[PDB]
Amino acid sequence: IIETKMLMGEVMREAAFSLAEAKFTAGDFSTTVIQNVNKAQVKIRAKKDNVAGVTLPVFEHYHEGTDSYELTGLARGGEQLAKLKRNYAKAVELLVELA
Amino acid sequence: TEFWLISAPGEKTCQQTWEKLHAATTKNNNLAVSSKFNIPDLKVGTLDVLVGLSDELAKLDAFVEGVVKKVAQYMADVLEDSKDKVQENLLASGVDLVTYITRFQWDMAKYPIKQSLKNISEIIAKGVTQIDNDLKSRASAYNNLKGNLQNLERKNAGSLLTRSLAEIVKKDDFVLDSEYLVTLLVVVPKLNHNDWIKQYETLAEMVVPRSSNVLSEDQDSYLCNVTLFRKAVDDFRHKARENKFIVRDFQYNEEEMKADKEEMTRLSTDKKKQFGPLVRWLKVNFSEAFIAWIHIKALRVFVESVLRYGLPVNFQAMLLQPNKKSVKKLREVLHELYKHLDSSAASQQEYYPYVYYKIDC
Amino acid sequence: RGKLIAVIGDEDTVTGFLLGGIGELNKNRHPNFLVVEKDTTINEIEDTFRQFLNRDDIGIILINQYIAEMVRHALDAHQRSIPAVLEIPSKEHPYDAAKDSILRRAKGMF
Amino acid sequence: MSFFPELYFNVDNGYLEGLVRGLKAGVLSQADYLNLVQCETLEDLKLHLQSTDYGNFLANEASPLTVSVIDDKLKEKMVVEFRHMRNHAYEPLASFLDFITYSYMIDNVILLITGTLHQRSIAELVPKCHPLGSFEQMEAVNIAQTPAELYNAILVDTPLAAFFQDCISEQDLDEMNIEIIRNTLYKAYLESFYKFCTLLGGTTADAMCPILEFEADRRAFIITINSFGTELSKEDRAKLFPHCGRLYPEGLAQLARADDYEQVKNVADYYPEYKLLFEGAGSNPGDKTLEDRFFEHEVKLNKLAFLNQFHFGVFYAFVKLKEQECRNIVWIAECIAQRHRAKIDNYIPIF
Amino acid sequence: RGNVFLRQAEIENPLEDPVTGDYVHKSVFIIFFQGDQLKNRVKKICEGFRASLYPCPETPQERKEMASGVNTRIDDLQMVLNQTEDHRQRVLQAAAKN
Amino acid sequence: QQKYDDEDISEDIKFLLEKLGESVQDLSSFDEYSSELKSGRLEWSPVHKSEKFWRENAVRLNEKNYELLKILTKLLEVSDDPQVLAVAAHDVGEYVRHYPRGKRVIEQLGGKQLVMNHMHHEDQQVRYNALLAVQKLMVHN
């Protein structure tokens, strides 16, 4: 499990670098992301796991499919924000597995 | 290249020769190139399922059209002896493309008519899909090879500040077995090369005097170095950065530079050796693919003809190559020559009184 | 569809995680996340953490090393499975393997 | 006037032209970057930053080493200088700087929207706004969380009302989403500013009209790329395509149908100075993307305008050049803080 | 691509459209086809433009006589509707007086 | 809506309000309802407007082979007292308001014509009640 978590560290090193790139190219969109929060895009389907005679809770990533907020006004920052979205889309699933 | 195919009910047995060179139903007064299509005979099979069969067949036909145009586009992106602009004369299975559409050969061995026509269509889909998957793998692998070459050249691209000094300097240019010293390679431009060779004494202390020996001189900045105490590297750098003395700590390695260059040469030779056969495989894949495509286009034309004309399999078709800028006159004349076939219901838009699909580049 | 991941982190982490997709407004229309800064008192953080844990429709919780360290006793006061709490590295607080509740339950294995 | 400045222009503009020319020495060159990069620590980065015109700009603040405070102080220095020179302006330059302030007051007003959606007071959002839209006007506080109050509010004394009266209303703010409103207002201001510059002919128009045409063109191109894959409708893309570019005489209609980015390259092959940029758009690990190339060409046009001196671009190219410089500074500091030297130099240099 | 005979008839005195109010002349030009795919896409198309697909006439005459009986009921149904208009008419002036 | 300073007013009002509500709760029972429907004497019980009854416990009016519906149809056939007839018509209307199975049953029975005859009753209020009942028999008919 330590190696899974070190891999998570590597993944979020990549994520932080891409976040710095997003800050660089478009300047300032963080407040617009925090401001508009109405419904989620990935939820969890509660489940249980019969590894042995006893049962142990587990969880499943579920793509609810909500549309992502479009970033086209602030220097037309769509490509870089899409890259960051993909990076954190991977991170979400991997951390659900670790969870 | 643009090419036309028209089918007709075939009410008379004279239409066997009219498919070739009728005068009254000629195109452009016996000037357009017309040859009867190599028409096969297939089973009926179904009619209630046939409409959706032809619709999904048209969807798959657009799909394989995209596939073959993608193959041609990739083979043009090879950019050596095959391009959309030059050396574009790629033969249809060793015979000229026009020459094979004018001499299309139909075979039963590959695709028995006794089977369902859906069976044949899905076998064509399976074959083209395996070809496409192998093409995606080939694109990834071989373009990764070309990108490896390009990035190794990116490592060979740039002035000496970013380009290694494998074949420019020697192992002995710095102090091997240094006591407490470091031959910091402070590359100085030519506007200031004459200055460090005297200022080196004062720019730092606890250093090696008479360390004015230059290594090499380059267009952007002259290679040079200076020996000094390990803690004094900081002090000399901080004092020297203000007098236009760029600092660039270079490390010499015979083994690793030699290995990288040998890898480059290996990649180049192996790339030619993989590039020849790459063109061969692309050629054969494109080859089998368009022959399957002309076959499936003929199949869809057959299905539409059987849908339209009648219970007998008596129908008669032919290729057609109008002379340029007279095909509107043919539009009118063939409208006249095919409206009496229907003589009732069929505005026209796309539901012509004749059967037709367009083949092009 | 049942449970939704939660996020207590600084501006960088929360923006990154909200771009990952997670975050919904509940019956009270409170956010799924909280903003932590240098200008954020301990009591607010602790009360919000307990608030989230009481909203049983969350299930998963994401907290870095530092926020959890500030309320350490309130973190290790929790020993349950379904309302999982996660300890993640951070650019500002890279992980220390010596600090985890789950590996504290596993302490002695090495 | 009659094509004759320099008996009119210098009398009314040299007072600020000389001062801004003096302040221009604070923009760093590649020579300074040849020694900023050779630091390997944030303390030496601060030393090299404070050896320049930013003398002790972080003094008595932010004892621990970080990057955000650097950007905040840089922006503070920017806004105070911009207001300082705006404070001595003369009528034509006053209209120019008013438009340059509309550029950020559009951002501030769109930020004010959804404050009604979320039932928020203005005072909490004041520090969240960028200060350039301080709005020392009547009613600038306490919009009562109602869209009608926000609309009448902006109409009271906000100077951008003169252009919001013709393109948006309260009803329009509640139909489409916020991003579309942002795009619409920015496009309206851009075309209005293009017309304003066109009317005021001279060296100023001669240097700026290429710049704003380029802005319109890059906006159209990058939208068309980022709008192929979205829920938007091409009617809205036509609404939001700027209509003052080099492509306005021909090419904008092609972009309304250019879905694939390769088709955007084909439509940029209808203006060549953009074709060279799309050729520079590699989207590969080791080079820059198309948007970065457009920012590079923006900096190039800024330099070309800086070749001249008798223009109001001493207060338009000036501010955006310092924006570029501070963006480079922040990128370098951020990658230094993270210990990532792969893209230490992934920025647009200035001169 | 359908090739079956045409059951032709015409409607005179075109009672207004049920949901709008258009007294526009109507007619039926009906054809039957065997393909199930046709029964999907043709009917999708007619719903796209306009159509009334609810009933399904059947040559077995039991449905015909049942429909005639329902038609006989329609008249009494209409008389109850008339009594409803009568009630909501006579309840009006009684209130409007005061 | 009236407010006073004497808290005893409010306490007594709340006590009486709650107790009257529970009095209607206990008085409202399908058991005594069906008992009085079988007794032959009917009145305007408050359970008529209790939408909870007609929403949930209305299937209890279907006794063995719709026995209660049958004997209420017979009561509508025979009895001529306007009050009980209107009560039965209103109850049957509210029954068919929730059941299409009951709707097709009463269509089969011909009780629709019986309510039509009640729409011509000598008393006009009962005529209107029968009109309402038929309107409850009008759903997609």
Side-chain angles (χ1 to χ4, degrees):
Chain A
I1 69 168
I2 77 165
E3 194 62 22
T4 299
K5 179 175 67 63
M6 294 299 291
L7 199 48
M8 293 316 81
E10 181 72 19
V11 166
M12 63 191 259
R13 172 211 63 90
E14 177 72 277
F17 197 64
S18 51
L19 172 58
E21 293 172 351
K23 277 184 169 185
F24 164 64
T25 187
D28 190 12
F29 60 91
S30 281
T31 300
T32 67
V33 176
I34 298 174
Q35 183 175 185
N36 182 16
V37 177
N38 192 3
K39 287 182 190 294
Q41 198 258 323
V42 164
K43 299 196 180 182
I44 287 298
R45 300 169 57 179
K47 185 67 216 169
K48 308 175 177 179
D49 190 358
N50 313 290
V51 305
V54 301
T55 318
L56 315 183
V58 286
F59 292 130
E60 168 179 328
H61 63 86
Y62 174 21
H63 266 302
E64 212 75 59
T66 302
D67 299 329
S68 61
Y69 170 78
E70 184 176 358
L71 187 59
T72 43
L74 176 87
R76 284 85 171 94
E79 309 253 12
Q80 193 64 42
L81 192 71
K83 177 176 182 178
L84 188 53
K85 284 171 178 170
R86 177 50 52 195
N87 288 9
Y88 273 104
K90 302 315 297 172
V92 160
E93 283 189 80
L94 277 296
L95 277 296
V96 175
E97 294 188 5
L98 178 56
Chain B
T1 301
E2 295 193 353
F3 272 97
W4 290 249
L5 177 58
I6 294 175
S7 182
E11 174 58 290
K12 289 298 180 190
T13 294
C14 303
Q15 177 73 21
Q16 82 193 67
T17 72
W18 302 0
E19 287 160 299
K20 190 54 174 187
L21 284 172
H22 208 196
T25 70
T26 198
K27 276 74 173 154
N28 276 324
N29 189 31
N30 291 315
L31 296 174
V33 185
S34 178
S35 179
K36 179 187 167 186
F37 190 88
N38 182 22
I39 291 173
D41 192 12
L42 299 79
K43 78 185 186 182
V44 183
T46 180
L47 293 183
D48 298 333
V49 189
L50 183 63
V51 183
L53 182 54
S54 55
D55 303 331
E56 66 183 1
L57 182 65
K59 302 314 188 63
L60 294 174
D61 288 332
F63 191 9
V64 296
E65 179 179 359
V67 166
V68 299
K69 168 141 278 185
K70 160 169 58 177
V71 178
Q73 183 63 29
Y74 184 77
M75 196 189 281
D77 299 327
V78 176
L79 294 174
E80 304 297 331
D81 211 42
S82 190
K83 287 181 182 181
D84 301 306
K85 333 185 170 53
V86 297
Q87 283 287 347
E88 80 263 22
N89 55 7
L90 268 292
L91 309 171
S93 290
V95 175
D96 177 278
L97 167 55
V98 166
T99 295
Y100 182 63
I101 60 173
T102 53
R103 274 261 291 300
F104 164 72
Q105 298 315 316
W106 188 93
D107 59 82
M108 181 145 168
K110 301 166 199 167
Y111 294 100
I113 70 168
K114 54 175 179 182
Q115 293 173 349
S116 167
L117 318 188
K118 157 52 44 182
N119 189 358
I120 290 165
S121 66
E122 71 159 10
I123 293 158
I124 278 170
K126 187 214 306 308
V128 173
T129 301
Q130 303 334 120
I131 296 169
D132 181 79
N133 295 118
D134 174 41
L135 260 64
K136 292 183 293 182
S137 179
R138 160 188 294 96
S140 61
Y142 290 83
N143 304 137
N144 273 326
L145 182 63
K146 190 180 66 167
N148 286 320
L149 189 58
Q150 290 162 354
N151 297 125
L152 282 150
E153 290 324 312
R154 183 153 260 190
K155 299 170 187 177
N156 314 134
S159 74
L160 296 178
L161 295 170
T162 187
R163 166 162 179 161
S164 63
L165 325 175
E167 324 303 339
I168 305 178
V169 285
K170 206 185 171 191
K171 65 190 180 190
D172 292 323
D173 63 358
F174 56 85
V175 175
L176 180 76
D177 196 356
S178 290
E179 290 217 333
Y180 274 81
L181 296 170
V182 185
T183 311
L184 182 65
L185 290 95
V186 186
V187 183
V188 180
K190 70 177 183 173
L191 277 296
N192 295 101
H193 169 275
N194 55 5
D195 293 319
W196 63 270
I197 63 181
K198 308 171 187 175
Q199 292 297 339
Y200 69 102
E201 301 284 13
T202 305
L203 289 162
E205 300 311 306
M206 311 314 88
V207 308
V208 174
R210 294 173 176 171
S211 179
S212 61
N213 174 27
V214 68
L215 301 182
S216 171
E217 300 200 343
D218 202 32
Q219 74 292 317
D220 288 328
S221 297
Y222 288 2
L223 204 51
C224 77
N225 61 3
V226 61
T227 300
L228 72 165
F229 188 80
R230 304 204 175 107
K231 299 184 182 175
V233 186
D234 292 317
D235 185 8
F236 184 91
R237 286 183 286 188
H238 289 297
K239 174 137 188 53
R241 58 188 56 175
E242 307 301 327
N243 306 287
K244 305 302 181 184
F245 293 163
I246 304 175
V247 185
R248 166 67 171 87
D249 180 84
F250 168 80
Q251 179 58 37
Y252 182 92
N253 204 321
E254 176 69 56
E255 185 76 11
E256 181 255 347
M257 289 294 102
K258 190 60 61 185
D260 191 1
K261 207 92 201 74
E262 289 158 341
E263 288 167 55
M264 167 45 189
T265 60
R266 161 211 60 87
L267 195 144
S268 158
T269 301
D270 300 0
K271 168 157 206 313
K272 161 58 76 193
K273 292 172 172 171
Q274 288 180 359
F275 182 83
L278 170 65
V279 171
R280 289 183 186 171
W281 290 107
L282 284 172
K283 156 166 279 293
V284 65
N285 290 128
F286 183 77
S287 292
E288 293 180 354
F290 67 93
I291 290 170
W293 192 33
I294 193 66
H295 197 154
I296 202 175
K297 284 312 309 154
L299 261 173
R300 187 191 166 189
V301 174
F302 182 76
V303 175
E304 161 56 350
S305 179
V306 171
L307 277 163
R308 174 150 261 190
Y309 293 142
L311 186 71
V313 292
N314 195 324
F315 73 99
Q316 302 297 322
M318 69 190 183
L319 297 150
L320 168 59
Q321 190 271 329
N323 212 49
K324 186 181 177 183
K325 66 82 175 180
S326 48
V327 75
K328 301 177 181 177
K329 314 319 157 204
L330 295 176
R331 158 190 67 88
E332 290 288 353
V333 168
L334 301 201
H335 176 292
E336 294 174 354
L337 294 174
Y338 299 144
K339 60 185 192 188
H340 63 87
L341 305 170
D342 278 332
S343 297
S344 290
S347 66
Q348 280 201 356
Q349 289 179 334
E350 299 292 334
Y351 279 84
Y352 304 115
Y354 43 98
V355 176
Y356 168 76
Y357 293 130
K358 74 190 211 173
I359 302 299
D360 62 354
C361 307
Chain C
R1 183 51 174 80
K3 309 305 176 191
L4 179 56
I5 303 95
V7 171
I8 303 175
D10 56 2
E11 188 184 4
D12 293 336
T13 291
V14 69
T15 298
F17 289 12
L18 294 174
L19 289 176
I22 60 172
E24 174 163 353
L25 291 196
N26 60 26
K27 66 182 179 179
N28 282 6
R29 306 297 271 172
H30 292 304
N32 164 78
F33 62 93
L34 172 70
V35 170
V36 76
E37 299 290 319
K38 177 175 177 181
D39 183 16
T40 297
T41 65
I42 292 291
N43 283 46
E44 203 178 352
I45 297 169
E46 196 155 0
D47 297 8
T48 312
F49 175 68
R50 294 201 211 277
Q51 266 185 337
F52 290 158
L53 261 179
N54 300 324
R55 300 292 316 241
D56 63 358
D57 61 0
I58 288 171
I60 297 169
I61 288 160
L62 290 162
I63 301 178
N64 61 352
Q65 295 297 105
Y66 153 70
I67 303 153
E69 189 69 30
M70 278 194 323
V71 287
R72 173 55 50 168
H73 164 52
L75 173 85
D76 294 350
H78 179 273
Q79 197 283 308
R80 266 153 287 179
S81 164
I82 290 167
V85 182
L86 278 78
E87 299 196 25
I88 189 172
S90 168
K91 176 185 62 171
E92 303 294 327
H93 311 282
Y95 205 81
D96 194 357
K99 300 176 173 61
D100 207 330
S101 54
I102 189 57
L103 287 168
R104 179 179 177 183
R105 173 190 209 75
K107 187 180 177 184
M109 182 295 307
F110 180 81
Chain D
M1 283 301 190
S2 313
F3 296 101
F4 299 152
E6 180 269 334
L7 196 65
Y8 275 78
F9 176 78
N10 281 351
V11 174
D12 300 332
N13 282 88
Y15 167 46
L16 315 182
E17 192 172 353
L19 298 172
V20 176
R21 182 179 294 101
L23 292 170
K24 273 177 187 179
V27 180
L28 307 188
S29 181
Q30 187 60 23
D32 300 322
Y33 287 115
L34 294 174
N35 299 338
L36 282 147
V37 71
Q38 300 172 5
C39 285
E40 290 292 332
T41 316
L42 282 179
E43 184 66 20
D44 289 340
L45 178 63
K46 177 182 65 175
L47 183 63
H48 287 47
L49 283 175
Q50 298 194 336
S51 56
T52 71
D53 186 74
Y54 311 104
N56 286 353
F57 74 116
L58 303 173
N60 306 331
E61 180 176 352
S63 174
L65 299 173
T66 194
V67 188
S68 59
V69 297
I70 303 176
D71 179 65
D72 202 358
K73 183 64 65 159
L74 288 159
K75 285 189 180 176
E76 283 172 329
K77 166 171 186 63
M78 186 65 204
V79 59
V80 299
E81 288 160 307
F82 176 81
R83 299 156 164 178
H84 184 104
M85 291 325 138
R86 181 177 181 170
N87 202 281
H88 321 300
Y90 305 85
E91 165 159 357
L93 176 56
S95 304
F96 278 110
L97 294 180
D98 279 2
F99 276 61
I100 300 172
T101 318
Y102 300 169
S103 176
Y104 301 115
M105 285 175 178
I106 294 172
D107 182 10
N108 194 352
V109 299
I110 191 77
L111 175 58
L112 291 175
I113 305 185
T114 75
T116 67
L117 182 59
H118 301 159
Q119 296 78 41
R120 309 172 181 271
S121 176
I122 291 299
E124 176 76 339
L125 294 178
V126 162
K128 287 57 158 164
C129 294
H130 198 267
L132 280 158
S134 300
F135 284 142
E136 188 185 304
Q137 62 172 309
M138 291 304 306
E139 191 277 332
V141 69
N142 285 316
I143 56 168
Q145 308 90 34
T146 294
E149 176 50 278
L150 172 142
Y151 168 81
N152 188 358
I154 293 176
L155 292 199
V156 170
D157 176 39
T158 315
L160 267 163
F163 297 105
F164 294 167
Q165 270 192 325
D166 292 330
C167 299
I168 61 153
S169 72
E170 184 270 332
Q171 181 61 17
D172 310 327
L173 299 182
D174 294 331
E175 291 194 359
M176 276 307 180
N177 61 77
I178 309 306
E179 170 53 42
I180 292 293
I181 299 162
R182 178 180 183 89
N183 271 319
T184 288
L185 296 183
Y186 271 137
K187 178 183 142 284
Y189 158 80
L190 176 68
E191 65 183 1
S192 287
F193 187 47
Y194 179 81
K195 296 173 185 182
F196 182 89
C197 289
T198 299
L199 293 175
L200 302 183
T203 303
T204 306
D206 185 68
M208 277 151 177
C209 285
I211 283 172
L212 319 169
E213 281 165 335
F214 165 80
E215 289 296 286
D217 273 344
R218 65 147 301 294
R219 285 180 181 244
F221 281 137
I222 305 314
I223 285 184
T224 297
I225 289 167
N226 301 358
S227 78
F228 153 67
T230 181
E231 79 272 352
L232 198 56
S233 75
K234 287 178 172 56
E235 184 185 359
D236 302 333
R237 300 173 183 101
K239 286 178 193 166
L240 298 177
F241 280 169
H243 307 289
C244 283
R246 307 261 168 69
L247 274 72
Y248 154 69
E250 58 93 17
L252 286 186
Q254 304 184 10
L255 289 180
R257 300 292 187 274
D259 293 8
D260 209 312
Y261 72 95
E262 182 66 24
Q263 297 171 344
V264 183
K265 293 172 68 179
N266 298 331
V267 172
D269 296 352
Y270 283 91
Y271 295 83
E273 69 269 354
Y274 301 94
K275 186 176 184 299
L276 303 179
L277 311 175
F278 275 85
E279 282 176 0
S283 293
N284 302 335
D287 56 11
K288 295 184 184 178
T289 195
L290 182 74
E291 301 167 11
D292 293 339
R293 289 295 179 179
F294 273 118
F295 310 143
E296 277 189 334
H297 190 281
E298 198 171 358
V299 175
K300 176 178 182 177
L301 292 190
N302 291 329
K303 294 169 171 174
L304 292 178
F306 279 127
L307 296 176
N308 300 328
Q309 296 295 325
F310 303 89
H311 54 65
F312 297 88
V314 175
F315 319 86
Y316 182 76
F318 152 80
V319 301
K320 307 296 284 191
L321 186 82
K322 291 167 60 55
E323 190 276 331
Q324 188 62 63
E325 174 53 36
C326 297
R327 143 182 174 159
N328 307 319
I329 287 168
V330 168
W331 171 253
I332 298 159
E334 279 299 341
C335 59
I336 283 175
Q338 294 180 8
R339 212 211 52 64
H340 282 59
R341 294 290 167 284
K343 300 186 179 178
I344 181 63
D345 63 357
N346 176 27
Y347 70 88
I348 309 170
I350 290 172
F351 289 113
Chain E
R1 315 293 321 240
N3 207 323
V4 174
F5 303 120
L6 199 150
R7 181 87 197 91
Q8 176 172 0
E10 188 185 347
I11 311 190
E12 63 265 16
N13 298 339
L15 178 63
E16 291 205 321
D17 279 326
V19 299
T20 65
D22 308 331
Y23 208 95
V24 179
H25 298 260
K26 332 175 186 178
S27 176
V28 296
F29 292 78
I30 312 307
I31 312 184
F32 183 60
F33 302 121
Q34 301 295 331
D36 294 333
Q37 302 158 341
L38 296 178
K39 291 181 183 187
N40 296 115
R41 30 161 291 183
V42 178
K43 286 183 178 179
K44 154 153 181 183
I45 294 158
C46 71
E47 192 294 349
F49 178 78
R50 280 301 83 180
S52 176
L53 297 103
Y54 171 78
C56 186
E58 281 207 13
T59 302
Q61 299 87 18
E62 177 49 39
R63 170 145 199 180
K64 299 180 185 169
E65 306 204 21
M66 184 277 288
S68 295
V70 173
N71 182 16
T72 305
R73 296 172 188 175
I74 287 169
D75 303 332
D76 290 331
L77 275 291
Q78 183 61 14
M79 294 313 117
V80 171
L81 179 70
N82 299 336
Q83 293 162 325
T84 309
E85 282 102 11
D86 296 326
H87 181 74
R88 65 192 313 273
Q89 281 160 323
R90 74 219 190 211
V91 296
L92 306 175
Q93 186 60 263
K97 282 168 186 181
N98 296 115
Chain F
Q1 305 182 31
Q2 302 298 325
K3 297 304 190 183
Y4 293 77
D5 295 330
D6 176 39
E7 298 171 355
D8 303 352
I9 288 165
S10 182
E11 291 300 334
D12 302 333
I13 280 171
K14 173 180 175 297
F15 174 85
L16 183 63
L17 180 59
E18 261 298 291
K19 195 33 61 193
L20 288 176
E22 300 299 341
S23 304
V24 179
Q25 184 66 32
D26 182 71
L27 176 67
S28 176
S29 72
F30 168 77
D31 310 341
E32 188 72 14
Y33 180 64
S34 55
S35 310
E36 298 161 355
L37 289 175
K38 295 187 181 302
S39 77
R41 171 185 175 182
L42 309 185
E43 295 295 344
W44 301 93
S45 182
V47 68
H48 294 349
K49 304 301 180 184
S50 176
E51 187 57 61
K52 171 180 182 64
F53 174 109
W54 285 118
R55 176 172 62 244
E56 310 168 21
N57 317 87
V59 69
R60 312 274 279 106
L61 279 79
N62 169 26
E63 277 79 356
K64 180 182 179 182
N65 296 332
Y66 316 97
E67 177 179 359
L68 178 55
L69 308 186
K70 286 161 166 181
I71 59 146
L72 289 182
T73 309
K74 292 180 182 182
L75 181 65
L76 287 170
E77 286 163 37
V78 172
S79 183
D80 302 318
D81 179 297
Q83 310 303 327
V84 310
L85 285 180
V87 161
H90 173 69
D91 296 357
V92 168
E94 278 168 331
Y95 176 82
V96 63
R97 186 164 54 86
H98 298 253
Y99 299 115
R101 187 76 190 82
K103 191 184 199 287
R104 68 180 65 252
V105 166
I106 197 184
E107 291 163 355
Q108 294 156 0
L109 293 172
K112 164 272 192 173
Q113 185 56 71
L114 173 51
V115 187
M116 282 315 197
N117 301 326
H118 284 290
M119 293 177 70
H120 203 36
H121 201 202
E122 69 274 15
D123 199 323
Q124 310 305 273
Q125 187 62 37
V126 186
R127 292 178 76 156
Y128 181 56
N129 290 318
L131 168 56
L132 293 173
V134 172
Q135 289 167 283
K136 302 284 161 315
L137 302 171
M138 281 274 204
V139 171
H140 314 129
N141 187 1

mmCIF file of all heavy atoms in Angstrom, chain D residues 16-27:
data_model
loop_
_atom_site.group_PDB
_atom_site.id
_atom_site.type_symbol
_atom_site.label_atom_id
_atom_site.label_comp_id
_atom_site.label_asym_id
_atom_site.label_seq_id
_atom_site.Cartn_x
_atom_site.Cartn_y
_atom_site.Cartn_z
ATOM 1 N N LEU D 16 3.641 62.707 -19.760
ATOM 2 C CA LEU D 16 3.513 61.322 -19.323
ATOM 3 C C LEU D 16 4.406 60.387 -20.124
ATOM 4 O O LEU D 16 4.832 59.346 -19.607
ATOM 5 C CB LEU D 16 2.056 60.880 -19.439
ATOM 6 C CG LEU D 16 1.046 61.895 -18.902
ATOM 7 C CD1 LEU D 16 -0.349 61.329 -19.013
ATOM 8 C CD2 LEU D 16 1.354 62.302 -17.468
ATOM 9 N N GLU D 17 4.694 60.736 -21.382
ATOM 10 C CA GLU D 17 5.544 59.888 -22.206
ATOM 11 C C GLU D 17 6.933 59.756 -21.594
ATOM 12 O O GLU D 17 7.479 58.652 -21.502
ATOM 13 C CB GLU D 17 5.626 60.456 -23.623
ATOM 14 C CG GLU D 17 6.238 59.508 -24.635
ATOM 15 C CD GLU D 17 6.123 60.026 -26.056
ATOM 16 O OE1 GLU D 17 5.458 61.063 -26.261
ATOM 17 O OE2 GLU D 17 6.700 59.397 -26.967
ATOM 18 N N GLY D 18 7.509 60.873 -21.148
ATOM 19 C CA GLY D 18 8.823 60.814 -20.527
ATOM 20 C C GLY D 18 8.827 59.996 -19.249
ATOM 21 O O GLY D 18 9.744 59.208 -19.006
ATOM 22 N N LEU D 19 7.802 60.173 -18.414
ATOM 23 C CA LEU D 19 7.737 59.450 -17.149
ATOM 24 C C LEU D 19 7.624 57.946 -17.380
ATOM 25 O O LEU D 19 8.320 57.149 -16.736
ATOM 26 C CB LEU D 19 6.554 59.964 -16.328
ATOM 27 C CG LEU D 19 6.628 61.441 -15.933
ATOM 28 C CD1 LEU D 19 5.321 61.890 -15.299
ATOM 29 C CD2 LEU D 19 7.794 61.702 -14.992
ATOM 30 N N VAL D 20 6.754 57.535 -18.304
ATOM 31 C CA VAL D 20 6.617 56.106 -18.565
ATOM 32 C C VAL D 20 7.865 55.561 -19.248
ATOM 33 O O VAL D 20 8.247 54.407 -19.020
ATOM 34 C CB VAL D 20 5.348 55.817 -19.385
ATOM 35 C CG1 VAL D 20 5.283 54.339 -19.732
ATOM 36 C CG2 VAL D 20 4.115 56.229 -18.596
ATOM 37 N N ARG D 21 8.527 56.365 -20.085
ATOM 38 C CA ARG D 21 9.790 55.928 -20.668
ATOM 39 C C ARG D 21 10.829 55.693 -19.581
ATOM 40 O O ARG D 21 11.618 54.744 -19.657
ATOM 41 C CB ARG D 21 10.287 56.964 -21.678
ATOM 42 C CG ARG D 21 11.575 56.569 -22.387
ATOM 43 C CD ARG D 21 12.022 57.620 -23.388
ATOM 44 N NE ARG D 21 11.096 57.752 -24.507
ATOM 45 C CZ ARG D 21 10.185 58.712 -24.644
ATOM 46 N NH1 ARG D 21 10.005 59.646 -23.721
ATOM 47 N NH2 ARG D 21 9.434 58.738 -25.740
ATOM 48 N N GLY D 22 10.849 56.556 -18.565
ATOM 49 C CA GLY D 22 11.724 56.324 -17.429
ATOM 50 C C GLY D 22 11.373 55.053 -16.676
ATOM 51 O O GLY D 22 12.259 54.303 -16.258
ATOM 52 N N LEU D 23 10.076 54.794 -16.492
ATOM 53 C CA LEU D 23 9.669 53.591 -15.769
ATOM 54 C C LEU D 23 9.923 52.319 -16.573
ATOM 55 O O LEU D 23 9.986 51.230 -15.993
ATOM 56 C CB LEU D 23 8.191 53.655 -15.394
ATOM 57 C CG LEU D 23 7.757 54.685 -14.358
ATOM 58 C CD1 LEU D 23 6.248 54.722 -14.343
ATOM 59 C CD2 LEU D 23 8.313 54.360 -12.976
ATOM 60 N N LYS D 24 10.055 52.428 -17.897
ATOM 61 C CA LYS D 24 10.234 51.240 -18.728
ATOM 62 C C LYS D 24 11.520 50.480 -18.427
ATOM 63 O O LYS D 24 11.648 49.328 -18.854
ATOM 64 C CB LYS D 24 10.212 51.620 -20.212
ATOM 65 C CG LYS D 24 8.821 51.659 -20.827
ATOM 66 C CD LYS D 24 8.868 52.103 -22.281
ATOM 67 C CE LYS D 24 7.472 52.301 -22.849
ATOM 68 N NZ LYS D 24 7.499 52.767 -24.263
ATOM 69 N N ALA D 25 12.471 51.082 -17.710
ATOM 70 C CA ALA D 25 13.724 50.405 -17.397
ATOM 71 C C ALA D 25 13.544 49.203 -16.474
ATOM 72 O O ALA D 25 14.481 48.409 -16.340
ATOM 73 C CB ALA D 25 14.703 51.393 -16.760
ATOM 74 N N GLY D 26 12.381 49.047 -15.843
ATOM 75 C CA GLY D 26 12.146 47.966 -14.907
ATOM 76 C C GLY D 26 11.818 46.622 -15.517
ATOM 77 O O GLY D 26 11.672 45.644 -14.778
ATOM 78 N N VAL D 27 11.695 46.535 -16.838
ATOM 79 C CA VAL D 27 11.412 45.274 -17.514
ATOM 80 C C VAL D 27 12.733 44.579 -17.812
ATOM 81 O O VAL D 27 13.607 45.143 -18.481
ATOM 82 C CB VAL D 27 10.603 45.507 -18.800
ATOM 83 C CG1 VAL D 27 10.312 44.186 -19.498
ATOM 84 C CG2 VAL D 27 9.306 46.241 -18.485
#
